[PDB]
Scaffold this motif. Structure first.
Motif, PDB file in Angstrom:
ATOM      1  N   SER A  56       0.813  -1.235   0.000  1.00 53.68           N
ATOM      2  CA  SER A  56       0.000   0.000   0.000  1.00 53.68           C
ATOM      3  C   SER A  56       0.843   1.280   0.000  1.00 53.68           C
ATOM      4  N   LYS A  57       1.939   1.277   0.766  1.00 53.17           N
ATOM      5  CA  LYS A  57       2.683   2.500   1.002  1.00 53.17           C
ATOM      6  C   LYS A  57       3.974   2.593   0.206  1.00 53.17           C
ATOM      7  N   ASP A  58       4.590   1.445  -0.082  1.00 57.24           N
ATOM      8  CA  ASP A  58       5.983   1.433  -0.525  1.00 57.24           C
ATOM      9  C   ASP A  58       6.137   1.043  -1.996  1.00 57.24           C
ATOM     10  N   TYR A  59       5.062   0.597  -2.629  1.00 58.83           N
ATOM     11  CA  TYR A  59       5.174   0.207  -4.033  1.00 58.83           C
ATOM     12  C   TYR A  59       5.729   1.337  -4.935  1.00 58.83           C
ATOM     13  N   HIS A  60       5.365   2.586  -4.658  1.00 60.03           N
ATOM     14  CA  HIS A  60       5.918   3.706  -5.447  1.00 60.03           C
ATOM     15  C   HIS A  60       7.448   3.675  -5.476  1.00 60.03           C
ATOM     16  N   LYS A  61       8.077   3.340  -4.338  1.00 58.53           N
ATOM     17  CA  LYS A  61       9.544   3.210  -4.279  1.00 58.53           C
ATOM     18  C   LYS A  61      10.170   2.242  -5.313  1.00 58.53           C
ATOM     19  N   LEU A  62       9.520   1.087  -5.524  1.00 61.47           N
ATOM     20  CA  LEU A  62       9.985   0.079  -6.488  1.00 61.47           C
ATOM     21  C   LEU A  62       9.933   0.584  -7.929  1.00 61.47           C
ATOM     22  N   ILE A  68       6.746  -4.741 -15.842  1.00 60.21           N
ATOM     23  CA  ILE A  68       5.601  -5.591 -15.483  1.00 60.21           C
ATOM     24  C   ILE A  68       5.376  -5.467 -13.946  1.00 60.21           C
ATOM     25  N   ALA A  69       4.367  -4.688 -13.538  1.00 58.61           N
ATOM     26  CA  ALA A  69       4.035  -4.384 -12.141  1.00 58.61           C
ATOM     27  C   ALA A  69       2.880  -5.235 -11.678  1.00 58.61           C
ATOM     28  N   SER A  70       3.199  -6.222 -10.856  1.00 55.29           N
ATOM     29  CA  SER A  70       2.221  -7.189 -10.358  1.00 55.29           C
ATOM     30  C   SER A  70       2.033  -6.995  -8.843  1.00 55.29           C
ATOM     31  N   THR A  71       0.818  -7.247  -8.325  1.00 57.35           N
ATOM     32  CA  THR A  71       0.507  -7.406  -6.879  1.00 57.35           C
ATOM     33  C   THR A  71      -0.619  -8.449  -6.758  1.00 57.35           C
ATOM     34  N   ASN A  72      -0.544  -9.250  -5.676  1.00 57.06           N
ATOM     35  CA  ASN A  72      -1.660 -10.182  -5.299  1.00 57.06           C
ATOM     36  C   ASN A  72      -2.411  -9.637  -4.035  1.00 57.06           C
ATOM     37  N   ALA A  73      -2.184  -8.370  -3.682  1.00 57.05           N
ATOM     38  CA  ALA A  73      -2.832  -7.828  -2.446  1.00 57.05           C
ATOM     39  C   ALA A  73      -4.328  -7.578  -2.634  1.00 57.05           C
ATOM     40  N   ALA A  74      -5.156  -8.235  -1.824  1.00 55.49           N
ATOM     41  CA  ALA A  74      -6.612  -8.034  -1.802  1.00 55.49           C
ATOM     42  C   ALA A  74      -7.027  -6.624  -1.343  1.00 55.49           C
ATOM     43  N   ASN A  75      -6.169  -6.000  -0.531  1.00 57.47           N
ATOM     44  CA  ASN A  75      -6.475  -4.720   0.139  1.00 57.47           C
ATOM     45  C   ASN A  75      -6.094  -3.473  -0.662  1.00 57.47           C
ATOM     46  N   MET A  76      -5.511  -3.683  -1.833  1.00 59.20           N
ATOM     47  CA  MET A  76      -5.198  -2.584  -2.718  1.00 59.20           C
ATOM     48  C   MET A  76      -6.050  -2.669  -4.003  1.00 59.20           C
ATOM     49  N   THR A  77      -6.929  -1.705  -4.214  1.00 58.38           N
ATOM     50  CA  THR A  77      -7.775  -1.736  -5.417  1.00 58.38           C
ATOM     51  C   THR A  77      -6.924  -1.473  -6.672  1.00 58.38           C
ATOM     52  N   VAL A  78      -7.533  -1.682  -7.834  1.00 57.25           N
ATOM     53  CA  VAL A  78      -6.930  -1.329  -9.118  1.00 57.25           C
ATOM     54  C   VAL A  78      -6.460   0.177  -9.165  1.00 57.25           C
ATOM     55  N   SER A  79      -7.332   1.081  -8.731  1.00 50.18           N
ATOM     56  CA  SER A  79      -7.085   2.520  -8.685  1.00 50.18           C
ATOM     57  C   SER A  79      -6.046   2.959  -7.674  1.00 50.18           C
ATOM     58  N   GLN A  80      -6.045   2.334  -6.505  1.00 48.76           N
ATOM     59  CA  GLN A  80      -4.976   2.538  -5.517  1.00 48.76           C
ATOM     60  C   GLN A  80      -3.633   2.031  -6.017  1.00 48.76           C
ATOM     61  N   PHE A  81      -3.642   0.895  -6.749  1.00 50.46           N
ATOM     62  CA  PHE A  81      -2.394   0.328  -7.269  1.00 50.46           C
ATOM     63  C   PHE A  81      -1.842   1.279  -8.312  1.00 50.46           C
ATOM     64  N   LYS A  82      -2.665   1.686  -9.278  1.00 49.20           N
ATOM     65  CA  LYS A  82      -2.286   2.729 -10.261  1.00 49.20           C
ATOM     66  C   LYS A  82      -1.745   4.018  -9.599  1.00 49.20           C
ATOM     67  N   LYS A  83      -2.415   4.508  -8.562  1.00 51.60           N
ATOM     68  CA  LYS A  83      -1.963   5.722  -7.880  1.00 51.60           C
ATOM     69  C   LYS A  83      -0.522   5.528  -7.334  1.00 51.60           C
ATOM     70  N   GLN A  84      -0.250   4.420  -6.639  1.00 51.43           N
ATOM     71  CA  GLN A  84       1.163   4.140  -6.263  1.00 51.43           C
ATOM     72  C   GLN A  84       2.149   4.172  -7.470  1.00 51.43           C
ATOM     73  N   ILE A  85       1.762   3.602  -8.602  1.00 55.29           N
ATOM     74  CA  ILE A  85       2.619   3.600  -9.790  1.00 55.29           C
ATOM     75  C   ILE A  85       2.875   5.019 -10.357  1.00 55.29           C
ATOM     76  N   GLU A  86       1.828   5.848 -10.499  1.00 50.79           N
ATOM     77  CA  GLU A  86       1.988   7.238 -10.971  1.00 50.79           C
ATOM     78  C   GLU A  86       2.868   8.031 -10.039  1.00 50.79           C
ATOM     79  N   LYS A  87       2.715   7.790  -8.738  1.00 49.88           N
ATOM     80  CA  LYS A  87       3.574   8.472  -7.769  1.00 49.88           C
ATOM     81  C   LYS A  87       5.053   8.118  -8.080  1.00 49.88           C
ATOM     82  N   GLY A  88       5.343   6.825  -8.256  1.00 49.72           N
ATOM     83  CA  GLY A  88       6.658   6.401  -8.662  1.00 49.72           C
ATOM     84  C   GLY A  88       7.216   7.040  -9.939  1.00 49.72           C
ATOM     85  N   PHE A  89       6.369   7.245 -10.965  1.00 52.01           N
ATOM     86  CA  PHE A  89       6.829   7.761 -12.271  1.00 52.01           C
ATOM     87  C   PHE A  89       7.234   9.239 -12.294  1.00 52.01           C
TER      88      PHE A  89
END
Ligand SMILES: Nc1ncnc2c1ncn2[C@@H]1O[C@H](CSCC[C@H](N)C(=O)O)[C@@H](O)[C@H]1O
Length: 380
Positions: free
Chosen positions: A302-308, A323-344
């Motif tokens: 949830s918090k640290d994926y942007h770092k990767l 290729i950015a994969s997660t199996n976390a039930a607690n992170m939605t599609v939109s939350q996962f994308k938000k971590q990725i944009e933060k990283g970029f």
């Protein structure tokens, strides 16, 4: 059984087809581990369910109809789930896949996997563990030709369940390619089957002639698939010592020369620093961490994926792919994308694809949270 009155919110979930009973909606609750009949605000019958603690839930809806939970009920359940899966049984290229997936097959709290001649059951709460006799009895009627079976407890952690013993390690086939797996060791088996189609894409040539970095590799199943697809070289990084022998085993099983396949035992955050210092860059970077991990940092997806994403980009070839994969039930599609944009940051990028759970990992179409796998392919 007890008739249970539910509040309006609990009601609204049921009528749209959500099977999961969330604790938030049942704050009243001083009953547990048993089958109940649920009723509305004005005394109308809503369905038969069972109660058991399972992460954020208190139970699952079993049917909108008034039913008895017994073994004949499970025979029906497994006849239906077997019938959806005829194609898996007719094609010989894939001998390990999921037979039953919680609410995806209309019974939350149970999964069942096939691995060659053996099956694996996983219990996600204490109620289903209490009734395993009748679950296992029903399954063995419907699937009588497995040699043996194992169980995982998900709520001593692993145990032999019935029939013959499997070897400590053995080979299954997925997409026509061999993988070394094991059924009686901790919570994992050498492979996450739910990534079958991402692996297939690599075997088909998606990394042909390319260099691949595979982060949190586990047993390097993504690296072996890439290598079988003509990848020029692979590097597989995992914190755990066991990654060496368990990765070597897939490569030997496919008679692959490892001249250009490197296995690395290292913290992924140390790997990023090491790779920058040595000017290493890769055409494709596969990122797939666990959802939570412990101990020289604590990792929460949830918090640290942007770092990767941020640090991977520093070591990616021009026109490279993440290729950015997660199996976390607690992170939605939109939350996962938000971590990725933060990283970029400001860096231009294009989302080429989103992959989620394959059809054997069946999902409750009404509950988006059930589709827990998210895999983005991103072009830089
Ligand atoms: N900081 C870190 N650096 C490297 N590996 C880590 C890590 N924290 C956890 N891990 C590893 O992450 C793995 C989680 S399982 C990941 C599945 C894997 N992507 C696959 O394709 O099969 C475990 O093997 C654990 O050893």
């Amino acid at each position: 059984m007890i008739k249970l009155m539910v509040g309006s919110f609990a009601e609204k979930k049921l009528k749209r087809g959500v099977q999961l009973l969330s604790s938030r909606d049942y704050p009243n609750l001083n009953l547990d581990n048993q089958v109940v009949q649920l009723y509305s605000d004005a005394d109308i019958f809503l369905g038969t369910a069972y109660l058991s603690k399972q992460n954020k839930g208190v139970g699952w809806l079993i049917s909108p109809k008034k039913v008895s939970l017994n073994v004949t009920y499970f025979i029906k359940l497994f006849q239906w789930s077997k019938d959806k899966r005829k194609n898996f049984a007719h094609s010989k290229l894939t001998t390990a896949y999921r037979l039953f997936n919680q609410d995806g097959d209309s019974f939350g709290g149970v999964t069942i996997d096939c691995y060659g001649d053996f099956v694996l059951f996983s219990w996600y709460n204490s109620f289903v563990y209490q009734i395993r006799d009748e679950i296992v009895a029903a399954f063995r009627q419907v699937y009588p030709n497995f040699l043996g079976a194992y169980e995982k407890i998900r709520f001593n952690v692993s145990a032999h369940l019935y029939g013959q013993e499997a070897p400590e390690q053995f080979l299954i086939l997925e997409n026509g390619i061999s993988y070394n797996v094991f059924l009686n060791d901790g919570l994992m088996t050498g492979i996450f089957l739910d990534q079958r189609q991402v692996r297939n894409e690599l075997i088909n040539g998606s990394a042909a002639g390319k260099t691949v970095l595979n982060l949190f590799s586990y047993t390097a199943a993504f690296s072996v698939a890439a290598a079988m697809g003509g990848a020029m070289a692979t590097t597989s990084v995992d914190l755990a010592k066991r990654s060496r022998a368990l990765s070597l085993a897939h490569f030997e099983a496919n008679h692959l020369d490892m001249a250009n396949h490197q296995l690395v035992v290292m913290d992924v955050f140390d790997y990023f620093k090491y790779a920058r210092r040595h000017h290493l860059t890769y055409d494709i970077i596969i990122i797939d961490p666990p959802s939570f991990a412990r101990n020289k940092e604590v990792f929460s997806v949830s918090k640290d994926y942007h770092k990767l994403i941020r640090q991977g980009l520093e070591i990616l070839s021009e026109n490279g792919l993440i290729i950015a994969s997660t199996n976390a039930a607690n992170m939605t599609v939109s939350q996962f994308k938000k971590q990725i944009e933060k990283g970029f940051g400001k860096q231009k990028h294009t989302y080429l694809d989103l992959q989620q759970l394959p059809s054997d990992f069946a999902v409750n179409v009404q509950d988006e949270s059930s589709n827990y796998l998210k895999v983005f392919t991103i072009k830089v």
